[PDB]
């Protein structure tokens, strides 16, 4: 996904904040990798960029790795407005504001978390092999696919 | 519950070797440093002989 530049630190085990508390919490025990990169040259424009929404008001602490797409009326006070989009029961869905003139802390950053799930099932996704260089006219060990 | 046994250890036990230490086990990447709580399970548990 894509977040603001100032909140790229909140995504970490134990670290809380705005997106780490109500939007996306990473568990304390995690064996993947979090990475981000600035994308101010292909996701920004001088017109008012509101194509990226985010939630700021939630019921309680969001469980790590959970999807909450419900749009129920938030309750910020003790008045039961009964879902009328009035005072103290605002709509808990807002959007960011990205401008090409803001500071680096307010620039959009595209992040991606790669969670590496290990299981008792046979391992499927792995990396390449050695594939070392080949020297000729010399007594060496060949280690081809089926002929060692 | 008067018989204990080890379930968590780093490596396999060497033939004819007794493990008397009780260092806490680390199942994750968090530096527990001897708290014995979440993700820091105790290496010695008890049986249940009913």
């Amino acid at each position: 996904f894509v977040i603001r530049g100032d909140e790229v630190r909140q995504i970490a085990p134990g670290q809380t904040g705005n997106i780490a508390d109500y939007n996306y919490k990473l568990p304390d025990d995690f064996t993947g990798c979090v990475i981000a990169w600035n994308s101010n040259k292909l996701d920004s424009k001088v017109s008012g960029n509101y194509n990226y929404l985010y939630r700021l008001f939630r019921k309680s602490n969001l469980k790590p790795f959970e999807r909450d797409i419900s749009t129920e009326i938030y309750q910020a006070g003790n008045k039961p407005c009964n879902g009328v989009a009035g005072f103290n029961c605002y709509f808990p869905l807002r959007s960011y504001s990205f401008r090409p003139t803001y500071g680096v802390g307010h620039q959009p950053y595209r992040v991606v978390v790669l969670s590496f799930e290990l299981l008792h099932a046979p391992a499927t996704v792995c990396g390449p092999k050695k594939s070392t260089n080949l020297v000729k006219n010399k007594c060496v060990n060949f280690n081809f696919n089926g002929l060692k | 519950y008067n018989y204990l046994y080890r379930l968590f250890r780093k490596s396999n036990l060497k033939p004819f070797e007794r493990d008397i230490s009780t260092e806490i086990y680390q199942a994750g990447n968090k530096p527990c440093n001897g708290v014995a709580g979440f993700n820091c399970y105790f290496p010695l548990r008890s049986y249940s002989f009913r």
Partner: nanobody, 119 residues
Framework: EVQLVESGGGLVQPGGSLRLSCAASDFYFDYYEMSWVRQAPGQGLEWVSTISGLGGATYYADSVKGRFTISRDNSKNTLYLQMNSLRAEDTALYYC?????????????WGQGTLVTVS
């Protein structure tokens, strides 16, 4: 501080079915990995299946590809194992285990176990 509760049957006809319901309580079953481990009399433990909690993919073993199915429920924290096409070679003690995918290779802790007979 953390325990497991299992349930099910004790005797199944060789060719019928059985309702196995592992009932967990106070678990972080959203990003944890819960599966079943069989214990046949005379040999050690064997892996049966696995149910991912991140995406929801269910993996099976080599000999139970087209005879087992698992239904995971998150409303009351219970799992259903509908075992079909049973024969006399499935005698084992089933254990409902739960571990963390972002940890070691071995499970954290098991339950009390359930015994079934098929012959």
């Amino acid at each position: 501080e953390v325990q497991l509760v299992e349930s099910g049957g004790g005797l199944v006809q060789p060719g019928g079915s059985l309702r196995l319901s592992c009932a967990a309580s106070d678990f972080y079953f959203d990003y944890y990995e819960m599966s079943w481990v069989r214990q046949a009399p005379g040999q050690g433990l064997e892996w049966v299946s696995t149910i991912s909690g991140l995406g929801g993919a269910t993996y099976y073993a080599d000999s139970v590809k087209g005879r087992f199915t698992i239904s995971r429920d998150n409303s009351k924290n219970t799992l259903y194992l509908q075992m079909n096409s049973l024969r006399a070679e499935d005698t084992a003690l089933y254990y409902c285990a739960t571990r963390s995918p972002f940890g070691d290779y071995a499970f954290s802790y098991w339950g009390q176990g359930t015994l079934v007979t098929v012959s």
